[PDB]
Each structure stands twice: as C-alpha cells, then as structure tokens.
Design a binder for this molecule. Structure first.
Ligand SMILES: *[C@@H]1O[C@H](CO)[C@@H](O)[C@H](O)[C@H]1NC(C)=O
Ligand SMILES: *[C@@H]1O[C@H](CO)[C@@H](O)[C@H](O)[C@H]1NC(C)=O
Ligand SMILES: *[C@@H]1O[C@H](CO)[C@@H](O)[C@H](O)[C@H]1NC(C)=O
Lengths: 56, 106, 164, 122, 56, 122
C-alpha cells in the first residue's frame, strides 16, 4: 500500500556535474528541501498512522 | 571567385542570320549561368537562366544549352531588336562574376 | 540555448537515429577547420559543416535552405552560430558584412547575429513538426547540420560516476 | 513593377556617397537586392547583397568595410552608403531585384534592374 | 467539509497560448506536478480517511 | 623557436597597414606579445601588448586609438593593424615574445624578437 503511493517516475532537473544559474538553483534547492520536509512529514505521519493502526 | 570568358567578343551580322555566343569558365558552374541583354545607356535585361530556361516575355528566337565548362546561347533569324551587348553571369560561387560582353553589329 | 531542456529531451529519447538534411552547398567551403578536435585529426564536429566562404575574405552567399519532415516523428534540428574572437577573424571566415541568421517554421521564428570578442559556438535547437518545413536563411557564421535526429523508445539519462 | 534611382552625384575623394533606389508595386520582403557597379566602359562588379527581411548584408572583399547597405520598409527605399570614395569609384551604380531561384548556391537571378546612378568622384 | 478545504482563488501563472522561458517553465511544471502529487496524495488520503470514518 | 615577419611595405598617408608575424614551435598561450617600433636611427617606442589567451590589448597613448591588435590561434599569427598612417610612422616594426617574469609591474621580458618589418609611409 505504501509502495503504490511512492513509486513515481523521476527525471533530473539539476545538472549535478555542472552548474545552473544560482538564483534558480536556490529556488530549486529550496523547493526540493521544502518538498522533502513535506514528504518527510507525510512519510512520518503515514508510517505513524500505519503503526498506530497496526497496534489498533 | 571564378573567371570566365565569352566568345566571340563581337560579331558582324545581318538580319535573318543565326548567332551563337559561348562562355568558358575556369571551373565547372554546372548549370549556373544567366544571360543578359544590354542596350547602350540602359540597364540590362534577363533573357535566359539556368543555361536553358527562358525568362517570361522573351521571344522564341532565343535559346541555349550547355553544362560543366561549356555553355552556349543562340539567336535565330536576327531582327533589328536583337542588336545589343550580351553578358554572362556566374552564379556558382562568391563573389559573383560577369562576362566581358558580346556585341552584335553590322 | 536552453541547454538543460534539450539535455532532458535526449535523456528520455530512447536513442538517436540520424538522417541527412539533403542540403547541397555549391560554392561553399565545408572542409575541416578547427584543431580543437585533433583527437580524430584537425577537423570540425563530425556532423555539422562550418560553411566558410569558398576562400578567405570572400563574401558569404545569401542562402535559403528548407527541410520538410518526411516522417511521423518530430525532427530535432540543431544549428550553430559562430562567435569569432574579433571582427578580423569573422571577416576572414565569412567575409565582410552584417551577419544575420533567421530560422523559421510554422510555429517558430528567431533571428540571430554573432557577437565578436570571444571564440565560441552557440548551438540552437528546434523540434520540427511532421509535414512542416524548417526554413533557414544564411548570411554567414552559420554552422549547418548535415543530419537531423529522431527519437526511439524512452531512455533514462542517468548522470553517474559508478561502473557498469 | 519599377525600380527608380536618385540623380547623378559628384563627390570629392574621401567623402561618402549615398545612392537611393525606390521600389514600386511589389513588396520588398519577397526579393533580395543587389548592388552592381557598371564601371565606365568596363565589366560589371558585384558590390554586395541586402536582405530587407532583417537588413542582413554581405560584401565582396574588393569593397570590404567601405560599404554599408541598409533598407527602409516604410518608404520602400534601398539606399546604400559608400565610404572613403576614390577616383576609381566613378561608375554607374545599379540596384537589382534578384529572384531567389538558385537555391543550390544562393546565386542571384537579376529579375529587375534599376535606372542606374552615375557617381563621379574627383 | 471537503469543499471548504479546496475552494481557493487561482490565477494564471503560465501563458498557455504563448511561451515562457523554458528553464522557468520547467521549474513551474515540476512544481505544479509535484504539488499535484502532494494534493492528489492529500486528496486520496483525505477521501480514504472520510471513507474509513464513514464506515466506522 | 622562431618568429618570422611579413615583407616590407609601402603605404600612402591616411592609409592603413597590417604587419604580420608568425610563430613556430611553442604555443602562443604561454607568452604575451608586444609591438615595438624601431624608429629609423632613433630609440625604441612601445606600441602595445596583446594577450592571445583572450585577445585583450593595451596601447600607449602615443598611438592611442590608431592601433588595433588581434591574434589568430589557428594560424599562429599576431598581425597588427595601424590606422591613419603618417610620414612619422616610417620605421621597423618588431614582434616580441615576452616572458611574464616581472610579476611586480607586469613588465615585459623580451625573450624572443621577430625579424622586423620595414614600413614606409609617403
Ligand atoms: C543546490 O544543492 C546542492 C546539493 O544538493 C548544492 O551542491 C548546490 O550548490 C545547490 N545550489 C545552489 C545554487 O546553492
Ligand atoms: C505530409 O505531406 C504530404 C504531402 O503529399 C501528405 O500526403 C501527408 O499526409 C502529410 N502528412 C501528414 C501527417 O499530414
Ligand atoms: C509545461 O507543461 C505544459 C503542459 O501542461 C507544456 O505544454 C509546456 O511546454 C511545459 N513547459 C516546458 C518548458 O516544458
């Protein structure tokens, strides 16, 4: 059930071996980091829900 | 650039005569030759292009052929209208070049 | 131009097939030029002709080229604009004049000019729709493609240091 | 339908000259225009080409940096500016409307010629 | 209850009939798509919660 | 190993001159090149410096805007263009390959000299 909610197609946005304009790169890094926290929150919450439900 | 020569540089001819004018380029200009008619004190006019295709409005007296390094222009049955200086143009490569001019006289 | 977008397109292309533009360049020099690619010998990039004047300092001809896309796949077309180190270098290569390049399609139009003061090739790209015709106008400083590209089967463009 | 040209001019050496031609009838964007010199009893010399669609130009090395061509779409004028005039520049200058026929070489096809402008330098 | 959580004012960011710089457009498309997945996740989760609660 | 120069030239006043030097052996990017005038029986005059790594140039005020230097990496040529020639410009022009030794002042160290080109203006 968890896999079906995470298994998505991803592509490179950032050229890791090179450089992208820093102003945009800062937006992308900020966006990704913010989204990482959103997904980390969602992940912790979802796992916690699944754990509480498992106990229940 | 490409340098070419016309032959002959000038002719003496009368009405009803047939005239042939040729061009000899330093290198192949496969089909890229235009011919023009110039009247003294006036701008030249296109007669034939691509060494074989007549310009619209040009009378049947004019025709031409040739390829590579030998090109020809022929006029059949000369009229008073046809006594002019004829020029070649090489469209093959830059800078574009023109011939010496061939003049028809009597 | 838009290098990241283009790179991503290739990353998901599935691979590249090549097909000739069918462009005949009479009177135009297309010989090897740069020493930068000496690894294969002193020549320019394998599939894109510099289209230099037939001789040094000679004027570049005003060319019009057109390519119709013969297939149901969109064609990826790349052309370069050559930025010379200085005005004199540009003059030698493409002759004197205001160099202008125009590229047009049914849904695209852009003009370009080289800016002397630094050696560089700027590559620009277009995705040409089926049944359309890409029109090019050359006044010099145009590095023409000999071939175009078609995409085949959804690849994954991974950037990595790991061994296979 | 027509190409017409400005009157003959007299210039001193080292001066500049501007020669104008006006086009009537057809639009300019469909054709390329060339400047060709008719030397005073000598053969034709190509000076250069202008593409009115974007003002792009190309010049023969014989003239090189001495020539600046430009166009005016609002008045239908193709005027050319030649700098650093010399006594050797005395000639009749023609504007030619060239049809883009020779797609193989970008070669000109001189469909319509202008009146010709006599420029004398001395 | 669901309507009150979704009924928000929206404006056009992308000029659909024209073109925006592709680098920014890629960021916007990525951002919107990522947010679509976030909202789709939130929507599926919320609906699932409401469905489970309805059953309960 | 060598710097060699184009042949002597004669120019009219107000004209431009281009003097060429070719470098054989070593690459150009490791050295800076200078143009120095050897006036006809008078002392040396510095004209300017060119950095082939990016074509940057600097000129003495004595020549100011009259001089344009440029380089060609593909042919190993350092040709210089001098505009608005005067009778005072008659001289032997040298290309010098200067080793970047004096890091304290950016001063030149003339490691290798060219053949010298005699330019006569009159
Ligand atoms: C974005 O984050 C990466 C590490 O994930 C970092 O190397 C890069 O410099 C950052 N970009 C900018 C503009 O700081
Ligand atoms: C492409 O153009 C040709 C012209 O004959 C036409 O027959 C063909 O159907 C066209 N293809 C498409 C996708 O319209
Ligand atoms: C953004 O997505 C739209 C479709 O929603 C697409 O048409 C557009 O080209 C995309 N932008 C870029 C830069 O790819």
């Amino acid at each position: 059930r968890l896999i079906g909610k995470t298994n998505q197609q991803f592509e490179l946005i950032d050229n890791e071996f090179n450089e992208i304009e820093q102003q945009i790169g800062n937006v992308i890094n900020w966006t990704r980091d913010a989204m990482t926290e959103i997904w980390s929150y969602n992940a912790e919450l979802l796992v916690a829900m699944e754990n509480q439900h498992t106990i229940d | 650039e490409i340098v070419m020569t016309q032959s002959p540089s000038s002719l003496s001819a009368s009405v009803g005569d047939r005239v042939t004018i040729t061009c000899r380029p330093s290198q192949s200009i496969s089909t890229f030759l235009n011919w023009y008619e110039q009247k003294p004190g006036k701008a030249p006019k296109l007669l034939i292009y691509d060494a074989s295709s007549l310009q619209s409005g040009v009378p049947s007296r004019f025709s031409g052929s040739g390829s590579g390094t030998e090109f020809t222009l022929t006029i059949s049955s000369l009229q008073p209208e046809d006594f002019a200086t004829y020029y070649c143009q090489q469209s093959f490569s830059t800078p574009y070049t023109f011939g010496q001019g061939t003049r028809l006289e009597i | 131009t838009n290098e990241e977008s283009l790179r991503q397109i290739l990353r998901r292309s599935g691979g590249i097939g090549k097909e000739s533009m069918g462009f005949t360049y009479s009177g135009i020099r297309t010989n090897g030029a740069t020493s930068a690619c000496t690894r294969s010998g002193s020549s320019f990039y394998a599939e894109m002709k510099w289209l230099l004047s037939n001789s040094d300092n000679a004027a570049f001809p005003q060319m019009t080229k057109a390519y119709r896309n013969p297939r149901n796949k969109p064609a990826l077309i790349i052309w370069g604009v050559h930025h010379s180190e200085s005005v004199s270098e540009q003059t030698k290569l493409y002759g004197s004049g205001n160099k202008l390049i125009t590229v047009r399609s049914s849904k695209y139009q852009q003009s370009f000019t080289p800016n002397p003061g630094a050696r560089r090739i700027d590559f620009h790209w277009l995705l040409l729709d089926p049944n359309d015709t890409v029109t090019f106008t050359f006044n010099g400083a145009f590095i023409a493609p000999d071939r175009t590209s078609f995409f085949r089967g959804e690849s994954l463009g991974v950037q990595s240091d790991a061994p296979l | 339908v027509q190409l017409v040209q400005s009157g003959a001019e007299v210039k001193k050496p080292g001066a500049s000259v501007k020669v104008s031609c006006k086009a009537s009838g057809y639009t300019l964007t469909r054709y390329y225009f060339h400047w060709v010199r008719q030397a005073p009893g000598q053969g034709f010399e190509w000076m250069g080409i202008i593409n009115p669609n974007g003002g792009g130009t190309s010049y023969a090395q014989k003239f090189g940096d001495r020539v600046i061509m430009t166009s005016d779409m609002s008045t239908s004028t193709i005027y050319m500016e030649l700098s650093s005039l010399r006594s050797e520049d005395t000639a009749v200058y023609y504007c030619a409307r060239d049809m883009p026929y020779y797609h193989d070489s970008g070669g000109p096809l001189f469909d319509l010629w202008g009146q010709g402008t006599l420029v004398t330098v001395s």
